[PDB]
Structure 1
Amino acid sequence: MQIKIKYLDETQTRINGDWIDLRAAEDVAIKKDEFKLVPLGVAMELPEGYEAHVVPRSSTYKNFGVIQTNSMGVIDESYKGDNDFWFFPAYALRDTKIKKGDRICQFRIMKKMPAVDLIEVDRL
C-alpha cells in the first residue's frame, strides 16, 4: 500500500496509522464571517478501492478561528490527476491570518463502501 504525493512546489512542507496533517500552501487572511478555500498544496494518487476523509485538527479552531464548511471532505480514488490539488473550505468566526506551512486539517484513508443495491419499496 502506497500513496503517491505531488506538492504544488518546493516551498511546501513535506508530509511526515495516525491521521496525517495537511498544511496551508500559502499565507491566507480571512475576515470575520467570510469564507476562503485554503489551498493545501498537495495532490495524491490514493490506493485502489480507497477514499480519503479530511477533518480539521482539534487545534484548528483555537489556532485559527475557522470551521470546515463541508464538515468532512471526501476524496475519491479517481481524483488522482496532475492538477487535482486539495483545498480546505474555511469559514472564519473571527478575523484570522493563516501562514504557509501551518497545520490546518488532517486526513486518513478508508476502504470505499462495498457495492450495494438501492431498491425502491412502497412500505417499510
Structure 2
Amino acid sequence: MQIKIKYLDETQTRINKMEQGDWIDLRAAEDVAIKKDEFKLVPLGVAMELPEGYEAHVVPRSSTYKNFGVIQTNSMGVIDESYKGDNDFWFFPAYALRDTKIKKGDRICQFRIMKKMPAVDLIEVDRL
C-alpha cells in the first residue's frame, strides 16, 4: 500500500521516514510568526495522493503546545482521498495562545491514515 507524495520545494524535509505504523510527523514549510490570539494557516509543504478508500487524520504532536503555544483550531484535520491535486498542499490551522515563532522544519503536527467509514443510509423515522 503506497502513498505518492509531492514536496513544495527541494528544501522540505522528506518525511519518507515511515512505514512501520507510527504516526508520521509533519513540519512547517517556512518561518511563521503568530501573535497572541491570532490565527494562522501554517504550510506543511506536502501534498499527497492517499490510497483509494482511505483518509488521513492530522493532530498536533503532544509537545506542540509546550513548544509553540498553539492549538489546532479544527481539533483533528481530515484529508480525504480526493484531496490529491497537484496544488492540494496541507496546512496546520493554528491559533496562538501566546506570541510565538515557528521555525522552518519544526515538527508541529502528525498524521496517520485509516479506512474511510462504510457507506451508510440515513433513513428518517418519526420516533426513535
State the TM bucket, normalised to the shorter chain: over 0.9
Q: Measure, in 2, the Cα distance between the counterparts of 1:15 and 1:101.
A: 11
Q: Measure, in 1, the Cα distance between the counterparts of 2:125 and 2:103.
A: 52
Kindly provide the CA deviation profile for residues 61-118 of structure 1, in whole angstroms up to 9, marking residues without a partner as x.
0000000000000000000010000000000000000000000000000000000110
The count of residues paired between Structure 1 and Structure 2 equals 124
- What 5-or-longer segments of structure 2 have no aligned partner? none
- What 5-or-longer segments of structure 1 have no aligned partner? none
Kindly provide the CA deviation profile for residues 35-76 of structure 1, in whole angstroms up to 9, marking residues without a partner as x.
000000000000000000000000000000000000000000
Shift of 1:14: 0.9
Shift of 1:10: 0.4
Please provide the CA RMSD for this pair.
Answer: 0.5
Would you identify which runs of 4 or more consecutive aligned residues in structure 1 move more than 2 Å? none
Q: Measure, in 2, the Cα distance between the counterparts of 1:105 and 1:66.
A: 11
TM-score, length basis structure 2: 0.96
- Give the one of 101, 107, 114 matched to 1:110: 114
Shift of 1:9: 0.1
Which secondary structure state, in structure 1, belongs to the residue aligned with residue 84 of structure 2? coil
Q: Measure, in 2, the Cα distance between the counterparts of 1:120 and 1:39.
A: 41
TM-score, length basis structure 1: 0.99
Q: Measure, in 2, the Cα distance between the counterparts of 1:103 and 1:28.
A: 13
